[PDB]
Each structure stands twice: as structure tokens, then as C-alpha cells.
Design a protein around this ligand. Structure first.
Ligand SMILES: Nc1nc2c(ncn2[C@@H]2CN(C(=O)CCP(=O)(O)O)C[C@H]2OC[C@@H](O)P(=O)(O)O)c(=O)[nH]1
Ligand SMILES: Nc1nc2c(ncn2[C@@H]2CN(C(=O)CCP(=O)(O)O)C[C@H]2OC[C@@H](O)P(=O)(O)O)c(=O)[nH]1
Ligand SMILES: Nc1nc2c(ncn2[C@@H]2CN(C(=O)CCP(=O)(O)O)C[C@H]2OC[C@@H](O)P(=O)(O)O)c(=O)[nH]1
Ligand SMILES: Nc1nc2c(ncn2[C@@H]2CN(C(=O)CCP(=O)(O)O)C[C@H]2OC[C@@H](O)P(=O)(O)O)c(=O)[nH]1
Ligand SMILES: [Mg+2]
Ligand SMILES: [Mg+2]
Ligand SMILES: [Mg+2]
Ligand SMILES: [Mg+2]
Ligand SMILES: [Mg+2]
Ligand SMILES: [Mg+2]
Ligand SMILES: [Mg+2]
Ligand SMILES: [Mg+2]
Lengths: 220, 220, 219, 218
């Protein structure tokens, strides 16, 4: 197929189905290598580090398939998207190096913002007439991404697409769909892979569920 | 714990329980990156490449726990165990580089054999009074390892332990258990990760099931 | 050791790799993207050397911060490659260490500094904290001198600077890092998140731009 | 096209020239603690090895494109070079849309002693393109006779890829078709290269000091 470049933020019109992580599946602690200082604070491993990398590699492939022959500006939503973002660039670089047929005019430009609606970033005025690809780690209620796309309309961009690693199946979801989705995960608080609980558990390579002890230990 | 070093080949006395791959689960083709030349010959992806490495990383951890501060000789069963073997060495080296308390007399020595009982190797007499760890890719009926352990007992080795990446749940299984098991997989013919079908699909990074077209296509 | 607390001095700084003047590799030696090959003179430092050096820097950094929480600051957007690579090996050390405490590790922070302008969030939370600044390259050292002085306004405990490349420019103001990777000749380099007009960031190797490259991506 | 003159290296691209007396000291990279007192210097970092091999795999695929070729791993010193080679070879095949499962690579494993060969029948290599993967070329005697031994099984072509070639005055003039590094006349270990079965697990290519030779002498 010839894929149209996505330009309807929240719709996910031609979005491919993500990996469906069923309710109450995964692996126990002793299955993979988990840091000793985190071992007593984790219920179970939801998604192994290797699966994440393998999925993102396919996401990077899907993204290149639709942005083939156009330059696009990626926006990293600090600081939870850092792991997802860097892995994405890694596999994007690999694609540009192993398929040939390439032009230094159809590549990507890195941008970094922090969203809390208030924005800590650069001017973003240079995004006019540009293809924007938003890189978010996780969608819960969809409030953050909904507000952010309206704020971005103020800079007169050409298109807005959203890639997301995890979508939580929360009933509080407002219907905001990403155009490139990695995983569909249960309604549980997850940590690891740059996803945190009070700035802890970011360095955990696997996606895990926090137990009662972890929440209590690192509570503010 | 204080672990005894295993010396009862086929018993799996203190074997830790492996990952249970259930019947009729896995991922479709469009989930991960599959080579275009193999895509029409694969039913589904059983185990992603990343899960394999993450489990093997833990196996190397489990292996080091019982062989800590002891020299042991690893035996690679060519040519299907190659991938498992290389990954095992990578993470073993990883452990040695990230530990201030080790000695060059407590490491591992590589040996390579070909089993078709016919054995293609070098001496095997140098294994006298040595700790031996057999590295097998997959145990099906358990006949190969049962005879091989008897033949290996002719060289007066100290101990014989077996690590295995996949054990198939075949009713024809003779009860041979490995001491370090990675995955327990359904009774289906799998390929990928150095596992072949008529010397094909070895270069496939994921563990997959061949469809009917694939079996017919590469039949001799 | 002692934990460094004198930004610009490099009191106990270890000697870095000295990349000599007029050495490196030609284009056909390593893998270079086809779209950048005609715009590159030579490969100065291979991608693999970078990873191996950073892996050692992470070891030196953990040696002095062992049992201490420290805050790493990524100086966007050129330090990104260095920063992510640094965390990878730091996690690696923490993941195999049976003598660690989740209260004593590292905390990530991100700032954008241009020449002096600061785009960030709080940094007031760096009070009574050990600060480790992660910079990709030191040229004249002016940006880092003002930033370390400005950072002194937040009453932090310590300020240490780790740097991947230091250029031997006669314009150097004498600012020394505490953890240096390479000492490079006075030439304009690109690759490994180092750019020329937002280009060449995706280049895995550290390379020198030719005259055509300068003209092509000129503004 | 396909190299078919073993030992000549007719169209071999010149490799990286590691000059006499360059490299890095111990405190430069990560070295295992049980090996630090037994190593003089680091000659070639592990990363340079991988990056060079990645380019070698590219060069190899350029000439074998659209044809089946059989790779031969000379155990057990070529294991490191071989596994990395297959990694990047697979890497190319996984991102290429013009590949054919009829035209890829087939792995073989032989063990060479000093000339006797412990392997399979090798009769399945009849009329096949063969690529020999050797860890190091010193005098070139071992590889010279093996090519003669392999040419009796009626193979189509014989090409040789080598990671390191030593500048020893005892060299017989045997040239490889795909060369990684040209290294000085010194005994190196690491990256599956051994000294009495030691230092194989060493990720960097290093030079053994006098104490190390003394320590692990048989
Ligand atoms: N570790 C975890 N984090 C979560 C979880 N659900 C949400 N979140 C996110 C919490 N969180 C932050 O910590 C923001 C600051 P940073 O950590 O730097 O990205 C925002 C939440 O992301 C979802 C929002 O975008 P949304 O609700 O508007 O869709 C979760 O189950 N675990
Ligand atoms: N790809 C796959 N291979 C399999 C499968 N079941 C068995 N096997 C193995 C087939 N096979 C070989 O091809 C031997 C040659 P090599 O491939 O070079 O190691 C031996 C089988 O391994 C199990 C025997 O040791 P056992 O029956 O005695 O326990 C399978 O479901 N998929
Ligand atoms: N590609 C290259 N970039 C360089 C080079 N020397 C400096 N620089 C840096 C150029 N540069 C920027 O592009 C700033 C924006 P960003 O790329 O997003 O961090 C600042 C320079 O960094 C040195 C300052 O810290 P300093 O002057 O205080 O020592 C160089 O030889 N090549
Ligand atoms: N670690 C090191 N190993 C070396 C060195 N020079 C040679 N060699 C090789 C030593 N060696 C072996 O140990 C054979 C067994 P294996 O190690 O399992 O392949 C053979 C030598 O390879 C060169 C032969 O092909 P050639 O001399 O006939 O040209 C060296 O400077 N360091
Ligand atoms: Mg977020
Ligand atoms: Mg959070
Ligand atoms: Mg087998
Ligand atoms: Mg087989
Ligand atoms: Mg900078
Ligand atoms: Mg710049
Ligand atoms: Mg050899
Ligand atoms: Mg040897």
C-alpha cells in the first residue's frame, strides 16, 4: 500500500493494532535479571526489555514506511519518553544505513519539550510547514496529548502524528488514539523503561508492576 | 542459597522452573521485523528475539551462581546450539567484567562437538577430572543427550550438567531433564535462532513456526 | 578518591585519549550512511571507540560516587548521544551490583544552554545535591564557565563536569573537566549528536566535514 | 566478481594499518581485573573490531549478492570473528527487500591442526562458493595447505576473509580477499585469540606481558 501521512491527532485513522498484553499475564521476578535493590519492590514483570526493543524496531519501520521521502520533526516528551525516543532513533539510523536509496533532505530533526497546560521547551516556531511526530511513552487518560495538540496548532504546522509505546486500558480514556502504537497494557501502575514513581524505577530495563512495598518506600 | 554443583545428567534435581510457553499463543507476522524472504513461510512468531536474550542472560546468571569460583568446560553441540552458545558466552563475559572478585583459574573453556552414536571432535580425554556443562539448543525425545552422557562418562569427568534453551512437551519424552532450562515450548516444529528446517531458517532471529507452504517449499 | 568540587579545575582528572593531529581513517574503512559520504573528509573516532571509552568513564564516575546519589544533567541537544550511552553503562553497573541502594543512584535532568541562555524547569531542587554535568564538547569553555557560575546560585553541594571531547583550540579559557573522554585536534567535527546546522546528528562516527559539506548545509 | 585465487588477494581492499607501537594503556578502557596484571597494552578496542567487521560483512555481501555461499568457521579462534560476521550478515538480510532464501549463507565448522582436518566429509561443498573465515594469518602455512585440501572437493571458488594479518618476516605471501587489520609482529590475545586456552574471553585485542606468558605457560 501507499500510506497517506497521518494528519488527524487523536483519531488514529490508519493505525496498526498494537501488542495486546492480556489482564494478568507476565513473568515472575526470578525469570529475568532484576536489580537486587528493586527486587523486593516489584510484583511481576509485565514486558521484558527485549520485547520492547523488538517492538520499537517495528514501530521505526512503520514510521519510515509512511514518512518515506519527507523530512519530519520528532518531539521527545521529557522525561519518560527518553528510553522510547533513543531506541527509536537507534533503529531509524539503522534503517537509513541498511536499505540504501537515501537523501540528506528526507531525515529527522530532534526536538525536546516538557509538558505538565504549560510547556518548557524551545521556540517551536520553526515547526511551521513541518511534519511533526510526537513521541510519548504512555497514554492514560489522554488529557495531556489532547491539550498539547491544540497548543501546537498555534505554530501552523503541516501535519501532526503521534507514536506511543503503551496505551493503558483505563475507563477514564478520552478516546485519544495514537497513529503508531506499541503495546496495549492493563489498567495497572507500571514502572521501568523511563517510566517512574517519584523519580524512581526509571533505570529499570523491564516494564514492571510496583508492589505495596515499593509505593510505600518511595512515597513523598 | 548454597547450591550443590549438579552431577546427575538427566535428573534436573535442583533445576529452576522455566518459562511456560502456553499452547496457541504468540505473535502475528506484522508484530515484529521478519525478513521479507521468510515472511510467506511463517505461521506466527512464538518467542521474540529479545525474550530469548533476556532469558539467556538470566541462565548465565543461574549458571554462574553454581559454578562461582570454579572452572567448568562448556560443550557446544553444533550446529543448532551455536546461537544459544554465543549468547551464553556474551553474558558470562559480562558477569566477569562487572565483578571485582574473580580469578583467571576460575573461568570457562570452550569445546565443540558434532553429534549425528557418532561424535566429531578432538580428544575428549582432557575432560578427565573436569566439570562439564553441555549446551543444547533443544530437547525433544531426550534420546540424543541420554546416550551422549553415557559416552561422556567414559572419560572419567567429575560432573555433568546440562543447560537447554527449549524443551518440547512431547509425550514421547524419556524424562531427561536439564539443570538449566530456558523455555518449555508446545509440541510443534519450531525454527529460528540456529534451529533449522533442512538447513533453512537458521539466520532468523525469532523463534517461529513454519507454515505448510514453508515445509513444502524447502523439502528435499 | 575525592569527589570533585571545583568546576573548571579538573584537580584529579585522569588523562584522556589523545587523538593525534592528522590521524584517523578514510571513508571506505567503516560504515558511513550513503547520504553523508560525499560530505565527509575522514573518520576521526569510530563509533565503537566512543562506546568503549564512555563505558570506562561510567566506571570512573561510579568509583567516586559509590554510595552517593548524584544528579546527571544532559546538556541538550548535542550531549544526547553521550548522555544515553553513559546511562546505559551506569545501569549496567547497577544491574550486576549486589551492593547498591535505590536511595543512592542517579537522577536525570535536562537543560538547554546556548550562547548565556538557560531553558530548563526548576534546578532549585539541586540544592544540597551532588551535580554531574554532561557535556558533549568543550571548545572555548565560555559556555560552561558561565553555566557553572550560574549553577552556583542554587546552593548545590558539588559541581563536576564530564566531557566527551575537548578541543585543543588556542581560544581555550582554561576550563578543565573532571572526566574527559578524548582530546581532539582543532578541527570542526560532526557525528554522534554533534551537528552542522542540525545535520549529521544521526552519524554514528565522529567525522570531519569537507568543504562541500560546509557549503551544502550552509544557511 | 567472485574471488577465485586463494592466497593472491587480487582485488583485496587495503586494511587498517596498525602501526608499530601505537595503542592505548590499561587505564583507557574496561579490562577484566583478573587480566589487568597480565596485559601490556590494548592494541585494538573491541568496538573498532565490531565496526570493521560490519564493513567487512558489507564488502562480502557486495560480491556474493544473489548467490549462495558457504562460510567456514575455523574453530576455535575464529569463533568471535565468525559470530560477529553472521550478526551483520543477518542484519543486512533483515533490512533488505531484494533477498532470496535460495541465495544466502550456509555455515560450516572445521578444526585445523598442525596438516590435519577434523570435520565432516565436505563433499557437500562440491560446486559451491566457499568463504573461509580465519582469525589470524601469521606464516600463512596453515591456510595455504587448507586451500589445497579444499580444492580437491571440487568447489567452485575459494575466498578468504581474515580479521588480522601479522607482519611477520616468515610470511609466505598468502593474501586474504577481505582483510580487517594489519598488525605488528607481536603475540596478541583476546577476541577468541588465545595463549594456552587463556584470554579468549577478553573482548579487546591485547598484548601479553612477560608475567602473563610466565604465568600461563604449560
Ligand atoms: N510510571 C507510570 N506513569 C504513568 C502511568 N500512567 C500515567 N503515567 C504518567 C505519569 N506521568 C508523569 O510522570 C509525567 C512526568 P514524566 O515522568 O517526566 O513523564 C504522566 C502520565 O502519562 C500519561 C499522561 O500523558 P495522560 O494521563 O494525560 O494520558 C503509569 O501506570 N505508570
Ligand atoms: N528446528 C527444530 N529442531 C528440532 C525440533 N525438535 C527436535 N529438533 C532437533 C532436530 N535435530 C537436528 O537437526 C540435529 C542436527 P542440528 O540442527 O545441526 O543440531 C535434533 C533434534 O534435537 C532434539 C534431539 O537432541 P532429541 O530428540 O534426541 O531430544 C524442532 O521442533 N525444531
Ligand atoms: N559540530 C561541532 N560543534 C562544536 C564544535 N566545537 C564546539 N561546538 C559546539 C557547537 N555548539 C552548538 O551547536 C550549540 C547548540 P547544540 O548543538 O544543540 O548543543 C556549541 C559548541 O559547544 C562548545 C561550547 O560548550 P564552548 O564554546 O563553551 O566550549 C565542533 O568542532 N564541532
Ligand atoms: N593468540 C594468537 N594466536 C596466534 C598468533 N599467531 C598465530 N596464532 C594462531 C595460533 N594458532 C592456534 O592456536 C590454533 C588453534 P585455535 O586458537 O583454536 O585456532 C594458529 C595460529 O594461526 C595462524 C596460522 O593460521 P599460520 O601460522 O599457519 O599462518 C598470535 O600472535 N596470537
Ligand atoms: Mg508522558
Ligand atoms: Mg511519573
Ligand atoms: Mg540439538
Ligand atoms: Mg537441524
Ligand atoms: Mg555543547
Ligand atoms: Mg549545534
Ligand atoms: Mg586460526
Ligand atoms: Mg590457540
Amino acid at each position: 500500500h501507499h500510506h497517506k501521512i497521518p494528519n488527524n491527532p487523536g483519531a488514529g485513522e490508519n493505525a496498526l493494532e498494537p501488542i495486546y498484553i492480556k489482564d494478568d499475564d507476565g513473568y515472575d521476578i526470578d525469570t529475568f535479571l532484576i536489580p537486587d535493590h528493586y527486587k523486593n519492590y516489584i510484583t511481576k514483570v509485565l514486558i521484558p526489555n527485549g520485547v520492547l526493543k523488538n517492538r520499537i524496531e517495528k514501530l521505526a519501520f512503520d514510521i519510515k514506511q509512511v514518512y518515506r521521502n519527507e523530512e519530519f520533526h520528532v518531539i521527545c516528551l521529557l522525561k519518560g519518553s527518553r528510553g522510547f525516543f533513543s531506541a527509536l532513533l537507534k533503529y531509524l539510523n539503522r534503517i537509513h544505513n541498511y536499505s540504501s536509496t537515501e537523501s540528506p533532505k528526507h531525515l529527522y530533526v530532534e526536538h525536546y519539550v516538557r509538558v505538565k497546560i504549560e510547556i518548557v521547551s524551545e521556540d517551536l516556531s520553526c515547526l511551521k510547514d513541518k511534519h511533526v511526530l510526537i513521541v510519548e511513552d504512555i497514554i492514560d487518560t489522554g488529557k495531556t496529548l489532547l491539550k498539547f495538540c491544540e497548543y501546537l496548532k498555534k505554530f501552523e504546522v503541516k501535519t501532526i502524528a503521534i507514536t506511543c509505546l503503551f496505551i493503558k486500558r483505563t475507563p477514564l480514556w478520552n478516546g485519544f488514539k495514537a497513529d503508531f502504537v506499541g503495546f496495549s497494557i492493563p489498567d495497572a501502575f507500571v514502572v521501568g523503561y523511563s517510566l517512574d514513581y517519584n523519580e524512581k524505577f526509571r533505570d529499570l530495563d523491564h516494564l514492571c508492576l510496583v508492589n505495596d512495598e515499593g509505593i510505600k518506600k518511595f512515597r513523598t
